[PDB]
Amino acid sequence: PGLEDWEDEFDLENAVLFEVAWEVANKVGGIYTVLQTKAKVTGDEWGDNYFLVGPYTEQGVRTQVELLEAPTPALKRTLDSMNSKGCKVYFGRWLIEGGPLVVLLDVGASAWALERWKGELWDTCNIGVPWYDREANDAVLFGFLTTWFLGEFLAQSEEKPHVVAHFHEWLAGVGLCLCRARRLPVATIFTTHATLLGRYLCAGAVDFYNNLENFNVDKEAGERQIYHRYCMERAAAHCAHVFTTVSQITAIEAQHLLKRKPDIVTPNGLNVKKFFQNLHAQSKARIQEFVRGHFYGHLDFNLDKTLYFFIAGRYEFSNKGADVFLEALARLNYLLRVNGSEQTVVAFFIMPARTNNFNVETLKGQAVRKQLWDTANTVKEKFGRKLYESLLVGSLPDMNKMLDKEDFTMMKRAIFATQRQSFPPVCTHNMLDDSSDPILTTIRRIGLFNSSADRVKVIFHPEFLSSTSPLLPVDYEEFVRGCHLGVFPSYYEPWGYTPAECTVMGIPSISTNLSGFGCFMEEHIADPSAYGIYILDRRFRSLDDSCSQLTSFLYSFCQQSRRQRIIQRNRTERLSDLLDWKYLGRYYMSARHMALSKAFPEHFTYEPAAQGYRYPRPASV
Amino acid sequence: PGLEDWEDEFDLENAVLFEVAWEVANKVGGIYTVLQTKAKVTGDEWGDNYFLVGPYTEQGVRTQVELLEAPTPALKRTLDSMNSKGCKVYFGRWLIEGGPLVVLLDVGASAWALERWKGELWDTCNIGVPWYDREANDAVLFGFLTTWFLGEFLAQSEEKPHVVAHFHEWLAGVGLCLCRARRLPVATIFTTHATLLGRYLCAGAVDFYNNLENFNVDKEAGERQIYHRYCMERAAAHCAHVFTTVSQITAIEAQHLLKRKPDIVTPNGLNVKKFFQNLHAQSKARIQEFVRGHFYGHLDFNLDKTLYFFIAGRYEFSNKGADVFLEALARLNYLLRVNGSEQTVVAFFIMPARTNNFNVETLKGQAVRKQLWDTANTVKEKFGRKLYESLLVGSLPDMNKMLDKEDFTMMKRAIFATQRQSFPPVCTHNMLDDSSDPILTTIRRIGLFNSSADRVKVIFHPEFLSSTSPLLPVDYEEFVRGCHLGVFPSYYEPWGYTPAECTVMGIPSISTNLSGFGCFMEEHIADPSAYGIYILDRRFRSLDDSCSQLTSFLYSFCQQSRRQRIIQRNRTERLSDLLDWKYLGRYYMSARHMALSKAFPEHFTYEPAAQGYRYPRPASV
Amino acid sequence: PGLEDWEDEFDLENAVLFEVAWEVANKVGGIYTVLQTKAKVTGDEWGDNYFLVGPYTEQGVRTQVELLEAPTPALKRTLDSMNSKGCKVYFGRWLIEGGPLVVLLDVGASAWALERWKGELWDTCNIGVPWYDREANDAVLFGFLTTWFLGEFLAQSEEKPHVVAHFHEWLAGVGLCLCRARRLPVATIFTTHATLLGRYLCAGAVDFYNNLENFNVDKEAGERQIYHRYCMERAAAHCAHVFTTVSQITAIEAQHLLKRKPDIVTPNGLNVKKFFQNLHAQSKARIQEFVRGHFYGHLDFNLDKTLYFFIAGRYEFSNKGADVFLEALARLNYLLRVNGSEQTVVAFFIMPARTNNFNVETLKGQAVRKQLWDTANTVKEKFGRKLYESLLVGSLPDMNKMLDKEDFTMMKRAIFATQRQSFPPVCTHNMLDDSSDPILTTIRRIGLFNSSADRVKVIFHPEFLSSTSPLLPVDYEEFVRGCHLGVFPSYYEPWGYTPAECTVMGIPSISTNLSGFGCFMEEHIADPSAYGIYILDRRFRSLDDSCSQLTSFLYSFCQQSRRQRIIQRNRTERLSDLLDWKYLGRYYMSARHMALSKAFPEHFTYEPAAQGYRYPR
């Protein structure tokens, strides 16, 4: 089912959508990609009545925004006015798939108003940003500039349209609060993509989710010198016609930290066109060549029985669950050894870290694999030419005479290059702090040294995968498509971008019910594991018990036949439509309709989601 | 040196060029390609003042001509007039590289005037076409239509421009004669691409060139029922301000048959951009695979010492010198056998003949080569995988164990497919008349049966080379580029299109001083054989002595080292600029200037060629 | 589950398997491929105690058999014996995936015995071959030669092994009957791959399957001058410890024509390794380019909504159900027109027929597509170079200036080549008899002229697909992988080789419950259509009603979303393991065990199939 026909009974009444985010036209997070990929559907629903309001940055305009003249006289008039009133407001087209119009506000250009604005802010919300907080002061400037733009756009518009302003973090929350305080006619959505407290409370506290009700949010933000940022976020959530979260776990966090249950959850959709079995085969061949190089001299395990697990994303050890994955990898190593399995699990940790360079053993192993591959290819081409020559003369090859002295010299050189005594390095790079690295510390603590006995090899690649890289000449998407199972046992993950992209790429993944993507899949798929989606229970299980469940998931994945693994990959391939904005734009549409009805009930009435996007038991299981 | 700067002192005075040929926009010979490829330079020199006058044909307009409206009022007015006066004149753009404008005259549409025109013709030139000659009557219609168009274009043109009409055979010669008879102001060129008598006199008479002075052209044309066509050609040559031939041999023939020495020779140029060592290597590999298939079971000669000679073009046995080439191939076979050379010469005869289908042995040999190639590739990929696996475990391959039972079964099947007792067929096809085929008759008479003792194998391919063909999936140009030596010992060849294209493709070729291309190269290259151009002397040597000289050429080519052959191919690659219209358009320009000066000496004065296009001894020989 | 572990409790007791078929080492049918692909598993179970007894042919030995010396002294002794007794017996290795040993018998070399042998036959089975039947007389020679070889191999073998002789047609049936008549210790399997009567009765009779009980087999064979061949087949089936059929439909035919229910059905397995979505995509791109050429000037339908149905195999119009497929294609054309669908169905008929050459319009359309493709590629490379040049100078392309006069000339030439008034030809070739062709006659009768209004285009390709072909440079397997749905509504099909290979290639197929493959899938898959296997009911429905059901199948396939079609293709991809000899060799193993137990109950006891090979869904 399409997006244009969703809530088609709703008439926007020539309303104008101002989507306000600090990340509009400047990549400072993952919300930039959310806005970029959602712009297509949003502009389809709103045409040119859709404006992304961002902060002006020289890089963003240089690279992403073509500066334009306002299409309508109202926009041009407001832009000229506030440009003459001491602000520096740019208008342009964001050079992305949607081609949306962007109002960019130079917050620095209008810093002169800061003291009169933040004081004004204190006169309306009792929120006073400390001077030393650059981001909070910039948020106040951006919010006051956005509210100025909205007021001067409604004032300088004869038709006086219905304005839906959709703010996306506490950085835009100030403008939201000012829209409500000035009382100008704006239907307001507030989407929080991550509760501000949530990050600190997960990182610091031993347990954060089960203690959500037992948190003094005011006090907790107070000890961390971010009380003003917390108050800005909570006022935006409070001063919003519609409050939205990207996830149901973020919805719980916002309920217990922003003291407002989201009126709707708007999961982060994706442009699935951007992203399976033959492509997976090529990527798996490339991973297999890398593993051949990395384990040169130690290729004593069957590679056709080798499984490629990966955990990727930002190098947040506990938030991304790399600790849980490593514990489960040690337990699965024990399981595969005691069960005497011929299965091998190479688990990749693609988590960027400060690295000096590629480890010498890693680069040497890649060189050794290249040499053996070239030697085998040269000897194979010589053998093929000689064999074709022999068969052309009706002669059966005499294999003893097929290879000459030069072939044996090349092959003996290759074999000499093969010998190694040291085990393959756990990490592919030179860590600036090997002792303090959580992944390497955990690996050396649990006993995963890529030994021959270890059925689980661990390859920590503390750097993003790039095609230009010498070690792995593969970008992240192709490597992932070559893997068997993404493992993202995240503890704190308001939305799982890495597991979501893994799923869109058709790779079975392990997420958690503590992650937004994991909750979204758990509530959209009847039997997620059937579809390649393992939802680890991290809310209601201890870290040790969650490690046990992850080991169970990894072991059951290892114990699948190749036929079962293929069936499961086909199902996860089917799952990609859930994560497309063509479905997840429904929730943004309904949030905007809800806000319009709340702010303008006389003009709009809202009639309350996953219809056509439910995945029951696969018919074939 | 470029063409725009040639005779740049000449000012055309807004003259208009009408190039008249029966082959304008209808491929009925090789002059079609001459006009097509010359149109680019002609339009560069004349812009839109250049018109190709052809006969209208439904196929030509359907495929090649976009019908247009006359760009100038004069053209539109004349077209409308003569379209209202009982003719059917189309105007359009010929969809070729030059994009020239074409005036197409439907000769059938104006056949009503035939009797009053041919009678009128008899009133001006005493030439009366017999009714039964379809081509001669069509030529009279086309000539009268062209002269009508020229008269009505000069009449319906206020400026009264200087019209250069360049007619290209006796088919346009009638219009030329009428232009001169009506005395309308037209500077006329007549190019003859082949004397009409020349064809019959070469085909019938035992010796034609040495008897040129001893020919009664009137009587000779009389016995052949083509006296009117001969008179049309001779009147066109006589009634032309400039008379032109494509070759100096054609110039001699025209002097002794049309009784006029050409005022200039205009060699057939070529669009050399359309067409060397790596491309030659790929084509030679493809020819080698074909020869492996064709000689399956008989591949007892060194293929790295095998030379690929070819003769191509129309299947005219004596005119193309296939008899001389076959005699020289028998003599070269004797030379290579008595000298005990390991050199092999596979001579290809690409001369289309009525063929039922591919010979069974030929298609079977190609299938056998495909099977052996696939078997060798499969066993080679298995060997390469096993060898890479063995070298990855630091193990040297045990060649006895490398190939399995299935590899040996596949290879034994291949070897079984290899066995054959019959020698490889001389012809690749099923000739409808094997007994009457001159090439096959000569091959069986001289003893070239593709036996093992024969150092010269002969492959007659009595059909054009096509990529779509199953036997050879190669077009003519790629096959030729894979060959070592084109052999075109033509007796009658007003221009050598096949040797010229062979040279442009950078292949050393044997032509004759009886061919236009051979004469052109002989007069443009100081040492033609140094440049890969062997000029057989067929004017002043008997057929037997010319066969001896061709055997000497073939043997000296065979006796070149690979280094000498490479040097010679580099030089023939250099020769391509002689055959480009960027040089050979000079002669057409000078012919048009000469005609303008002759017809309008008051307005134009002509100042009398190969400067910058003479090739002395290569600096390196 | 594997084949080595199937009935592993059974011990062969150093038994020797002689698999006797006229098609051993000489391709004279589809049983040749059955034996060739089954040889691997059979030799895995029997090692070198497995012999494929065939008729010697010069071509077969030249191409497929490496002549060898008998590995065992018993084999060498028997070979030398019967080579010295006026017969010519070759021993070798068949150069196939299994590398089995073949005892090839030159029946011509031993024709001297024919008259006495066929006398002996009449003295033992009352079967007398008429002199004029070359195949039946060769069958008698081959059977007597096989029984001679078996008797001399058991006699010239001190251990006296347990010999399992598995004969495969009525051509080997004579040898089977003689094995039983001489009473020599041979455990005999008879597999019939197609009842001899059934082939004649499917066509000649008004309707064959519903009249099986109402057939006088003796009389019916008599009218067709094949009574001796019928009696040979029926005696082989009768004189067999185990009787086997390749299908349950063949089992019914054998019950009602050979008067013996098969003791087991041994479906024709296949070497599935020899044969899905990216490969399908490439093949579908090739088919789409062919359709672009074929329908040049008439490409007014969405090709992303175009479905490629095909029917392939031997050009038996009624047996292969091409009539039913064409009727259903006309009905589906009506359905897609009245429903105003943008779906297009190009149905290919890959059924070889006597063709003079490629039709002029067809070759011209392929040339036009090649020219347009080359023109588009040339203009695209020029545009790409100019666009890269413009972007390298920081300049946005001026699209008006991007294409030059030469580009427009090339494109205008291409467009000129595009125009055509005649509709795309229904057939790609020049039929030697257009009026006599059943497919073309039916197409012109039902109104499928590849018109613009027709939502169903029909391309009859009356020739095998070859890569060497100029028209379609794709072999049969790649073309099929590019198709959406194989349609094999066969009436007579003892085993569906074409639908089976279709399924192994991961392409959904329509078969019938009158086909062996269709019955096999219907009894192995709970919901066959879910797996891309549509079983048309042709036993219990009239030809018109079967046409209606086929139209329903085709229409429901057309009405699947691309998601549903992908799911269905994934399931049919799963189905390939059912058709592998790794599973279907189980039935041959159990038939051989059953025959061993029947002939040697003292030495062997048989303990009775699809376990691990049933598909719930």
Author numbering:
A (entry chain B), B (entry chain D): 13 to 287, 293 to 625, 630 to 642
C (entry chain A): 13 to 287, 293 to 625, 630 to 638
Can I see the authors' text?
The 3D reconstruction revealed a tetrameric arrangement of human GS in agreement with the crystal structures of the C. elegans GS and yeast GS enzymes, with root mean square deviation (RMSD) values of 1.1 Å (between 484 Cα atom pairs) and 0.9 Å (between 522 Cα atom pairs) respectively. Density for the C-terminal GS interacting region of GN allows for model building of residues 300–332 (human GN34). Four GN peptides bind to the GS tetramer, and these residues form a helix-turn helix, where the first helix is denoted binding helix 1 (BH1) and the second as BH2. We were able to build a model for the N-terminus starting from residue 13, and of the C-terminus up to residue 625, and then from 630–639 (chain A/C) and 630–642 (chain B/D), that could help understand the mechanisms of GS inactivation. The N- and C-terminal tails of each GS protomer lie almost parallel to each other, and travel side by side along the GS tetrameric core to reach the centre. The C-terminal tail from chain B continues to travel further across the regulatory helices than chain A, prior to traversing away from the core. This allows chain B to engage with the regulatory helices α22, specifically phosphorylated S641 interacting with residues R588 and R591, which come from two GS protomers to form a positively charged pocket we have termed the “arginine cradle”. S641 is a major phosphorylation site involved in the regulation of GS activity, and interaction of pS641 with the arginine cradle in helix α22 shows the mechanism of inactivation of human GS through constraining the GS tetramer in a “tense state”. Interestingly, these “spike” regions were present in all the refined classes, and suggests that GS exists as a continuum of structures with a core inactive tetramer and “dynamic spikes” buttressed on either side, thus preventing GS from adopting an open, active conformation. Each human GS protomer shows a closed conformation of its active site, and a regulatory loop that only becomes ordered upon G6P binding is disordered in the human structure. However, our EM density maps show no extra density within the G6P binding site.
Glycogen is synthesised through the cooperative action of three enzymes: glycogenin (GN), glycogen synthase (GS) and glycogen branching enzyme (GBE). GS is the rate limiting enzyme in glycogen biosynthesis and as such its activity is tightly regulated. GS is inactivated by covalent phosphorylation at numerous N- and C-terminal sites, and is allosterically activated by glucose-6-phosphate (G6P) binding and/or dephosphorylation. Here, we report the structural and functional analysis of the full-length human GS-GN complex and the cryo-EM structure of phosphorylated human GS.
